[PDB]
From a paper:
Pp1a and pp1ab are processed by two virus-encoded cysteine proteases, termed the papain-like protease (PLpro) and the 3C-like protease (3CLpro). Together, these two proteases cleave the polyproteins to produce 16 nonstructural proteins (nsps), which are essential for the formation of the replicase complex and hence RNA replication. SARS PLpro is a highly efficient deubiquitinating (DUB) enzyme having the ability to rapidly hydrolyze isopeptide bonds of proteins that are post-translationally modified by cellular ubiquitin-like (Ubl) molecules, such as ubiquitin (Ub) and interferon-stimulating gene 15 (ISG15), which are two key regulators of the innate immune response.
Numbering used by the authors: 63 to 319
Write the structure that this text describes.
Amino acid sequence: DETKALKELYGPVDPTFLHRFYSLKAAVHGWKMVVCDKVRSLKLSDNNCYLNAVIMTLDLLKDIKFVIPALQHAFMKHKGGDSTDFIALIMAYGNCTFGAPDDASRLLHTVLAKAELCCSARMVWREWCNVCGIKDVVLQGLKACCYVGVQTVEDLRARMTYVCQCGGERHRQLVEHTTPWLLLSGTPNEKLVTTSTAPDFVAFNVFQGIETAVGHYVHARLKGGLILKFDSGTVSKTSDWKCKVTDVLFPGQKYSS
Ligand SMILES: [Zn+2]
């Protein structure tokens, strides 16, 4: 059966999927990954800056594997220097429109939702009320490595104190965290990023534009005491940048409360 072999290769995709993928592949055939400071960045074209941010961020995440065979194969082709299929496939899964700007964080998490981690990772949250008692919520694998809604590890680990259900005060706090890396994403947040403080994070994405909208994105990496800014095929370096941060990538966690 045609349907079955397709689902095997691409996962449970909708009827329009193959036409959208193949077409995107034709459309993005002119795009190019260029070498910038010895790494690959997607050269700006057709509002594709969000894809540069997505793909350069993915390239920093060791131990990920895609559970969809076509996506894993394209991913390995990309790692080997031929990124057309991967670009077109993530645009297809993301329901992206060629030539339109799009939301890099949203797409990044849509892509990672199709991935698994090739090693153990665990995140354990403790909830406890003075009435209800205790319960632990355990996330494993790739899900333990990503979190939306905060952009610092201090915030992530901060005890939360809320209104329960019965009427007693309920508490929530991260109590164990072991990962190979940690991706935190939030809404565009103006920060002065500086390498004099020597930050804990190793990379972050930057949103340019009005913060209610889909914007334009710059990928940034920390290296050699500098911020390396990859603006869709061009690289520049700075010690200091006032910018709106969205995604922030941290090294592996090894934490117990
Ligand atoms: Zn309670």
